[PDB]
């Protein structure tokens, strides 16, 4: 993760990095349900 | 994932809501994937 960009604050670049932030969110949810679904 | 501008014009507005829209097209992509399996 090296990331791409600093100088500046670019608002698209923290606009997309919160919408992924949300995705992200959402896939850890998913993820926690498919472990209770399987364990055991 | 509109992106020719003309919703959240403050910075935290359209950020916030691109996490929102983040999570939203996650569930549209599961909905799709579970179609694709087939329910029932």
Same mark, same amino acid.
């Given at each position: 993760?090296?990331? $791409?960009?600093? #100088?500046? %604050?670019? %608002? =698209? &670049?923290?606009?997309? #990095?919160?919408?992924? $932030? !949300?995705? =992200? !969110? &959402? =896939?850890? *949810?998913?993820?926690? !349900?498919?472990?209770? *679904?399987?364990?055991?």
């Amino acid at each position: 993760v090296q990331l $791409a960009h600093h #100088f500046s %604050e670019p %608002e =698209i &670049t923290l606009i997309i #990095f919160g919408v992924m $932030a !949300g995705v =992200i !969110g &959402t =896939i850890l *949810l998913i993820s926690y !349900g498919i472990r209770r *679904l399987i364990k055991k």
